[PDB]
Design a protein around this motif. Structure first.
Motif, short mmCIF file in Angstrom:
data_model
loop_
_atom_site.label_atom_id
_atom_site.label_comp_id
_atom_site.label_asym_id
_atom_site.label_seq_id
_atom_site.Cartn_x
_atom_site.Cartn_y
_atom_site.Cartn_z
N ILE A 226 49.30 15.73 -40.76
CA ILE A 226 50.15 16.58 -41.64
C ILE A 226 50.87 17.59 -40.16
O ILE A 226 50.13 17.94 -39.76
CB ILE A 226 50.24 17.46 -42.91
CG1 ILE A 226 50.86 18.11 -43.08
CG2 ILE A 226 48.76 18.10 -42.28
CD1 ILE A 226 52.33 17.11 -43.99
N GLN B 144 53.94 23.20 -44.13
CA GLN B 144 54.12 22.22 -43.54
C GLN B 144 55.79 21.43 -44.81
O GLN B 144 56.00 22.53 -45.57
CB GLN B 144 52.69 21.91 -44.11
CG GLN B 144 51.83 22.41 -43.48
CD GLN B 144 50.43 21.86 -43.73
OE1 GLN B 144 50.38 21.41 -44.43
NE2 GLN B 144 49.57 21.84 -43.15
N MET C 198 55.00 18.04 -49.49
CA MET C 198 54.34 16.23 -50.02
C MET C 198 54.26 16.26 -51.83
O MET C 198 54.05 16.92 -52.16
CB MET C 198 53.23 16.00 -49.28
CG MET C 198 53.18 16.02 -47.66
SD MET C 198 54.66 15.43 -46.23
CE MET C 198 53.22 14.17 -46.75
N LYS D 4 50.06 11.56 -44.85
CA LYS D 4 49.82 11.95 -43.97
C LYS D 4 47.89 13.22 -44.40
O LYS D 4 47.65 13.02 -45.22
CB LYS D 4 50.91 13.48 -43.55
CG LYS D 4 51.88 12.68 -43.65
CD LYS D 4 52.82 13.82 -43.06
CE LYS D 4 54.07 13.21 -42.45
NZ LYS D 4 54.63 13.93 -41.94
N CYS E 2 45.60 15.48 -43.81
CA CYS E 2 45.69 17.49 -43.86
C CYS E 2 44.42 17.86 -43.40
O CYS E 2 43.19 17.06 -43.75
CB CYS E 2 46.18 18.16 -44.55
SG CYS E 2 45.71 17.94 -46.73
#
Length: 340
Positions: free
Chosen positions: A74, A95, A98, A154, A156
């Motif tokens: 991320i 960010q 998602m 991703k 994170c």
């Protein structure tokens, strides 16, 4: 300053039409509409400055995520904070939004082999990069693996990440550990501070096993139950593996347990692809020296349809103190996002 649940979520001007998400581990999280780029984003409010320990995790994670640029990790889009140290009480981390995460996915959705394979590939691709930067994530688990609507994955939450330190990996038996219990490698309970790359591969192995059955493979209820869960599947460690544990408290602990035989992977997972189980075996090896490496896991026959080392980048720039100074480092670290 817009409020959310009566808490100041002060992200306006660029970020409008807020909607609450969670209270996470610590700090509040909301989605919001970005008015420059024309998509919705995720924002996390952090308030770490009154505690040395929360400052070090906020700083670790900001420094790492701003250094890293990789499709399976991320990115930080933006950091909102006051223009002056004195006015800086919170930091807001923006960010990409998602849809979901693999924890959420697993509790409700069956994964086809093609999805498990694709997610494992992306986990390992992102981990190659992290490891190449001499970083250890140290808290890989399904909730730290974000997925969007096209199933781009991703990694994170680098709050517990460290720079790798294998020469100082050793510690005593029963050394207290912060990372999530179910994904901790056996060596953490025995003789390891979690300062080698093999600790992340264990967690990846756990995640793979979890993907194959929608259930945690090693759901320990306490520090040493976690090890009895492991050895109930793996079976008692070999003599050669015990001979690597110099620590006598750890060694005698293992010697005190009744003999357990290995439970074959294809009995736990009779639906699984055989190449998946062979890779799972190599990741869930008791001995961390013999445990498969990230680049070898990528080269495994299971991932053959994705494997492409020229498209699996490594980091250009690998890595190698009171509250007051960490706040100043956080301020400096976030300065690039300020008007100017």
């Amino acid at each position: 300053p817009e409020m959310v649940r009566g808490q100041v979520f002060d992200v306006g001007p660029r970020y409008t039409n807020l909607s609450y998400i969670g209270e996470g581990a610590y700090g509040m999280v909301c989605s919001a509409y970005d008015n420059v780029n024309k998509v919705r984003v995720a924002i996390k409010k952090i308030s770490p400055f009154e505690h040395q320990t929360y400052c070090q995790r906020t700083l670790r994670e900001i420094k790492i995520l701003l250094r890293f640029r990789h499709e399976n990790i991320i990115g930080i889009n933006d950091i909102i904070r006051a223009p002056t140290i004195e006015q800086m009480k919170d930091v807001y981390i923006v960010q990409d939004l998602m849809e979901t995460d693999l924890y959420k996915l697993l509790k409700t959705q069956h994964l086809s082999n093609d999805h498990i394979c694709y997610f494992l590939y992306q986990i390992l691709r992102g981990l190659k990069y992290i490891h190449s930067a001499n970083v250890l994530h140290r808290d890989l688990k399904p909730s730290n693996l974000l997925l969007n609507t096209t199933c781009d994955l991703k990694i994170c939450d680098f709050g517990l990440a460290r720079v790798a330190d294998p020469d100082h990996d050793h510690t005593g038996f029963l050394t207290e550990y912060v990372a999530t219990r179910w994904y901790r490698a056996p060596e953490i309970m025995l003789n390891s501070k979690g300062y080698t790359k093999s600790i992340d591969i264990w967690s990846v192995g756990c995640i793979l096993a979890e993907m194959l059955s929608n259930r945690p493979i090693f759901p320990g209820k306490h520090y040493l139950d976690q090890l009895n869960h492991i050895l109930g599947i793996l079976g008692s460690p070999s003599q050669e593996d015990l001979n690597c544990i110099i620590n006598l408290k750890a060694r005698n602990y293992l010697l005190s347990l009744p003999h357990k035989n290995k439970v074959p992977w294809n009995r736990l997972f009779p639906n699984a692809d055989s190449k998946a189980l062979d890779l799972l075996d190599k990741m869930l090896t008791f001995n961390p020296h013999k445990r498969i490496e990230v680049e070898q896991a990528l080269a495994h026959p299971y991932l053959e349809q994705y494997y492409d080392p020229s498209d699996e980048p490594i980091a250009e720039a690998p890595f190698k103190l009171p509250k007051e100074k960490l706040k100043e480092l956080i301020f400096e670290e976030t300065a690039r996002f300020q008007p100017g």
